Design a protein around this ligand. Sequence first.
Ligand SMILES: CC(C)CCC[C@@H](C)[C@H]1CC[C@H]2[C@@H]3CC=C4C[C@@H](OC(=O)CCC(=O)O)CC[C@]4(C)[C@H]3CC[C@]12C
Ligand SMILES: CC(C)CCC[C@@H](C)[C@H]1CC[C@H]2[C@@H]3CC=C4C[C@@H](OC(=O)CCC(=O)O)CC[C@]4(C)[C@H]3CC[C@]12C
Ligand SMILES: CC(C)CCC[C@@H](C)[C@H]1CC[C@H]2[C@@H]3CC=C4C[C@@H](OC(=O)CCC(=O)O)CC[C@]4(C)[C@H]3CC[C@]12C
Ligand SMILES: *[C@@H]1O[C@H](CO)[C@@H](O)[C@H](O)[C@H]1NC(C)=O
Ligand SMILES: *[C@@H]1O[C@H](CO)[C@@H](O)[C@H](O)[C@H]1NC(C)=O
Ligand SMILES: *[C@@H]1O[C@H](CO)[C@@H](O)[C@H](O)[C@H]1NC(C)=O
Ligand SMILES: N=C(N)NCCS(=O)(=O)O
Ligand SMILES: [Cl-]
Ligand code: NA
Ligand code: NA
Length: 527
Amino acid sequence: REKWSSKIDFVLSVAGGFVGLGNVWRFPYLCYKNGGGAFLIPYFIFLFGSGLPVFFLEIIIGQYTSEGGITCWEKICPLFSGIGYASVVIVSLLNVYYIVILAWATYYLFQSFQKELPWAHCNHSWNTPHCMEDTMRKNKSVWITISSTNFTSPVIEFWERNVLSLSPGIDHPGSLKWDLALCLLLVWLVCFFCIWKGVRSTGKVVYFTATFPFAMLLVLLVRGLTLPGAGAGIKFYLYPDITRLEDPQVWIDAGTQIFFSYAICLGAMTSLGSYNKYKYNSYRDCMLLGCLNSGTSFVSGFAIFSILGFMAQEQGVDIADVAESGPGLAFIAYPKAVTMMPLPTFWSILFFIMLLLLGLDSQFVEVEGQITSLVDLYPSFLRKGYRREIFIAFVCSISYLLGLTMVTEGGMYVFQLFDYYAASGVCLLWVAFFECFVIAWIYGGDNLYDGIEDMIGYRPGPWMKYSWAVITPVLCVGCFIFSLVKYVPLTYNKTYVYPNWAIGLGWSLALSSMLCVPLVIVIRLCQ
Ligand SMILES: CC(C)CCC[C@@H](C)[C@H]1CC[C@H]2[C@@H]3CC=C4C[C@@H](OC(=O)CCC(=O)O)CC[C@]4(C)[C@H]3CC[C@]12C
Ligand SMILES: CC(C)CCC[C@@H](C)[C@H]1CC[C@H]2[C@@H]3CC=C4C[C@@H](OC(=O)CCC(=O)O)CC[C@]4(C)[C@H]3CC[C@]12C
Ligand SMILES: CC(C)CCC[C@@H](C)[C@H]1CC[C@H]2[C@@H]3CC=C4C[C@@H](OC(=O)CCC(=O)O)CC[C@]4(C)[C@H]3CC[C@]12C
Ligand SMILES: *[C@@H]1O[C@H](CO)[C@@H](O)[C@H](O)[C@H]1NC(C)=O
Ligand SMILES: *[C@@H]1O[C@H](CO)[C@@H](O)[C@H](O)[C@H]1NC(C)=O
Ligand SMILES: *[C@@H]1O[C@H](CO)[C@@H](O)[C@H](O)[C@H]1NC(C)=O
Ligand SMILES: N=C(N)NCCS(=O)(=O)O
Ligand SMILES: [Cl-]
Ligand code: NA
Ligand code: NA
C-alpha cells in the first residue's frame, strides 16, 4: 500500500538484495569443482540467454501488477499460481540453511579477537600428528620422501575439526555443538531485532555500508593479484577444457549459479519492484544492476583463484588437490590470504565484518520478501501490529530449531545435501522454465511490450522477446533431460558415497518444491 519515498531507495535495496554471499562464496567452489573456464562458457551463455531477461521480467511484472510473490501471478494467469508457492518453499529452505554460513562467519569473528590467529599454525588440542606447516609442507627433504598424500594443512584441519568436527558419515550424527548454536541464536536475534523496528536505510551511513564491501574486495584483489602463482590460477580459471563439456554436471551447475546469484525465482524481486512508481524507467537500472552483479562475481573470481593458485604452488600439489570441492573453499582461501596482510588481526576483523554485512543485508531482503509474500495472502489477519511481530518471532524460532540439525558433528553432510537439492539445481530450472513459458506463449511478448512502452516511453528491442520465447525453455529442457539420461549420484567433497536413503531425502527436498506446480493445477482444475 506504500511506495518508495524516493527512487534511490529502490536502487539501494535492489543493490543490497542480490549482492552478497552468492558472488563471493558459492561461485568460487562451483567453478573449482569443475574444470574452470568450461564452467565459464555455459555461465555466459546462460547469462545473456536467461539471466538478465528473467530478472527484467520479474521487475516489470512487479511494477505492472503492484503485488508480491504469489498474487502477481494471479493478474497474469490464475492457473499457474503455483510458481509463487514454489518460490516461497525455495526461499524458506534457503533461509534455513543460508544463515549457517553467517554462524560460521561470526564464530571466526569471535575467534579473531585473540592476539594470534588460531589457524595460522597447528599446535593445538585438535591437531593430528600428520600436521605440518604450509610453508614446510613442500620440502624435498622431509615431505616428498614419504606420506605425501597423508599430510594435511592447519587451515583445513581447523575447519574440519574445531568448527565442524566431522563425523565418519551422515549416519553418525554425534553430539550437538553448543557454541555454534549460540552463534546461530545471536545472528537470528540480530536479524529479528532489525525487523522489530523496521529499520531501513540511513541518511549518511548508506554511502558507507554500500561502499565498504567494495573497498574490501578491491584490497582483496590487490593482495591476491600480487602473490606468486597467480598466473597459473588465472589460466586455470579462464582456459577451458572441451572434454568436460560432455558431462551434464557442468552445464547444470553453471546455469543455476546465475539463477542463485541474481535472486531469480525467489519472489524477492517481484516484490522489490512492486513499490516503484508506474511511470518510471526501470530498463536502464535493470541493465546497470545486472552489469554490476556480473562484474562483481567475475572480479571476485579473479581474486579468489589467484590465491588458490598460490596455495596450490605453495603445497606442491595439483590445483584440484588443494582446499575443498565443497562449501569450505572460502573459509580456507580467504583466511590464508589475510594471514599475510600486515596486522593480520585487523584485516581479519574487517573481512569478517564485511562478510557479515554482505550476508545480513541479503538475509534481511529475503526474509522481508518472504514475509511480504505471506502477508499479501492475509492482510486483515496479518495486519501491522503485534500479530505481524509474533509472526516473525515464530518464523525465526522454527528456522533456528530446524537449522540446529546442521551444527551437530554430522551437520556438514546435511548442509551439502541442502545446498545441492533445496534451493538450487533442477527445481530452479523447473520454475524458470515455467515462468518463461507462461509469459511468452500464454500471455504474449508483444502484449507485454505494449505495457512496457506505455510505462517506459519507447518500444524496446526484440531481444528479450526472442529470449523468453525460445532461448530459455530450450536450455532448461535440454539440461534436465541430459541430466536424467546420464545420472551420477552426489558425492561430498570427492571421496565419499552417500547412502541411498540420504539421496531419497534429497530428492524429497527437491520434489517438495517441484510438486507445488502440478498440485495447484490439479486442485484448480478439480473444481
Ligand atoms: C513446506 C514448508 C516447509 C515451507 C513452506 C510453507 C508455506 C509456504 C505453506 C505451508 C502450508 C501452506 C498453507 C496450506 C493451506 C492453506 C489454505 C488455503 O486456503 C484455501 O484453500 C481456501 C481458499 C483461500 O483461502 O485462498 C490458503 C493457502 C494456505 C494458507 C497455505 C499457504 C502456504 C503454506 C503456509
Ligand atoms: C522451513 C520451516 C522449517 C521454517 C519456515 C516455515 C514457515 C514459512 C511456515 C511453517 C508453518 C506456516 C504457517 C501454517 C499455518 C498458518 C495459518 C494460516 O493463517 C491464517 O489464515 C490464520 C487463520 C485465519 O484467520 O484465517 C496461514 C499462515 C500460517 C500462520 C503459516 C505461515 C507460514 C508458516 C509459519
Ligand atoms: C518435506 C515435504 C515433503 C513436506 C510436505 C510438503 C507438501 C505436502 C506441501 C508443501 C507446500 C504445500 C502447498 C502450498 C500451497 C498450496 C496452495 C493451495 O491452494 C490454494 O490455497 C488455493 C486453491 C484454489 O483456490 O483452488 C492448495 C494446497 C497447496 C498446493 C499445498 C499442498 C501441499 C504442499 C505441496
Ligand atoms: C605444541 O608442540 C609442543 C612440541 O614442541 C608440545 O610440547 C606441546 O604440547 C604442543 N601444544 C599443544 C599440544 O597444545
Ligand atoms: C627442509 O627440511 C630440512 C630438514 O628437515 C631443513 O633443513 C630445511 O630447512 C627444510 N626446507 C626449508 C625451506 O625450510
Ligand atoms: C597414507 O595414505 C595411503 C593412501 O593414500 C594409505 O595407504 C596409508 O596407510 C596412509 N598412511 C601412511 C603412513 O602412509
Ligand atoms: N538470492 C539468493 N538465493 N541468494 C542471495 C544472492 S547473493 O546476495 O548471495 O549474491
Ligand atoms: Cl554470480
Ligand atoms: Na547484500
Ligand atoms: Na549475487
